[PDB]
């Protein structure tokens, strides 16, 4: 495998054990393993991560060229199950917030705006994230909202502006991805729409179903229905319909959704810190 040497090509030099100190484990059995540490010279607290190595190559390459305030920025990488340094967001994932707390429209609008700012940046740089879900939204202790997980990323171009592979997580996948049709950046808009449903209902639609049954239900049902749409303002219902539109041409882009009236009721990001406190208490 010559893909191991293309990985080794631009990922160093230097010993990470001397640049950063006070390594504290926070990682799980997903791979693993994630640790916090502190920059010796500046005092910055950092997040350090420790089958398919090409997803790691793609992660690094896409991350270091697409730096943005709404993306969990890549800082550095080192030697050797590899050592990837990135910014630390102590508030944890949006998943704990959506499953343990009730979010108001002001707080939802604030999270949607921050995620849409990241998406308009990625789409303008021809990057389709393809794995938008609350699990890949990290929260700062100050209410910062940042996008992570660039492994399943697709770099488009005018020559080949479409993909047709089944990539992402079933419950958040656009019907055009599910049905293996030619798709583009607007698949991330659908996934954000599904993430706004998580913020309302606690779960994406069909979570109680098996991933294949959900895949079938997305293909046959199309636009998902809320359990209680009457609970939402007409402006929020309109924002959701524009995210979850079956017709790709009718579905909003990130640039045009950033102009939606729903985002005008967005609360300051500080309005998210009680949600983080509640989610930490609920999962403690
Ligand atoms: Cl690794 C990872 C975690 C690790 N666990 C964790 N717990 C509490 C806080 C916190 N903050 C982080 C993490 C990161 C950089 C991505 C490593 N910066 N700040 N991370 C969680 C959700 C993920 N969703 C995708 N990857 C995720």
UniProtKB/Swiss-Prot annotation:
Outcome of mutating residue 49 to R: Strongly decreases activity. Abolishes kinase activity
GO cellular component, one term: intercalated disc
Active site: 131 (proton acceptor)
Record note on modification: Autophosphorylated in trans, meaning that in a dimer, one kinase molecule phosphorylates the other one. Activated by autophosphorylation at Thr-165 in response to a conformation change, triggered by interaction with GTP-bound CDC42 or RAC1. Activated by phosphorylation at Thr-165 by BRSK2 and by PDPK1. Phosphorylated by JAK2 in response to PRL; this increases PAK1 kinase activity.
EC number: 2.7.11.1
Annotated control of activity: Activated by binding small G proteins. Binding of GTP-bound CDC42 or RAC1 to the autoregulatory region releases monomers from the autoinhibited dimer, and enables activation by phosphorylation of Thr-165.
Protein name per its UniProtKB record: Serine/threonine-protein kinase PAK 1
């Amino acid at each position: 495998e010559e893909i191991l040497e293309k990985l080794r090509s631009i990922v160093s030099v230097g010993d990470p054990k001397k640049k950063y100190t006070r390594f504290e484990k926070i990682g799980q059995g997903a791979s693993g393993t994630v640790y916090t540490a502190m920059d010796v010279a500046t005092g910055q607290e950092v997040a350090i991560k420790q089958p398919k190595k090409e997803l790691i190559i793609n992660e690094i390459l896409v991350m270091r060229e697409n730096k943005n305030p709404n993306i969990v920025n890549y800082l550095d990488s080192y030697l050797v199950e590899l050592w990837v340094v990135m910014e630390y967001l102590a508030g944890g994932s949006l998943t704990d917030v959506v499953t343990e707390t009730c979010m108001d429209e002001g707080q939802i609008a604030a999270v949607c705006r921050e995620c849409l700012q990241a998406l308009e940046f990625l789409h303008s740089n021809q990057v389709i994230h393809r794995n938008i879900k609350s699990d890949n939204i990290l929260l700062g202790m100050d209410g910062s909202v940042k996008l992570t997980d660039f492994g399943f990323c697709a770099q488009i171009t005018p020559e080949q502006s479409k993909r047709s592979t089944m990539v992402g997580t079933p419950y958040w996948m656009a019907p055009e991805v599910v049905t293996r049709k030619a798709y583009g950046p607007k698949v991330d808009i659908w996934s954000l729409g599904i993430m706004a449903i998580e913020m309302i209902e606690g779960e994406p639609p069909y979570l109680n179903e098996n991933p294949l049954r959900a895949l079938y239900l997305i293909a046959t049902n199309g636009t998902p229905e809320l359990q209680n749409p009457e609970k939402l303002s007409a402006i929020f219902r309109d924002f959701l319909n524009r995210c979850l539109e079956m017709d790709v041409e009718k579905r909003g882009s990130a640039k045009e959704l950033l102009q939606h009236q729903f985002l005008k009721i967005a609360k300051p990001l500080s309005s998210l810190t009680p949600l983080i406190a509640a989610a930490k208490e609920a999962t403690k």
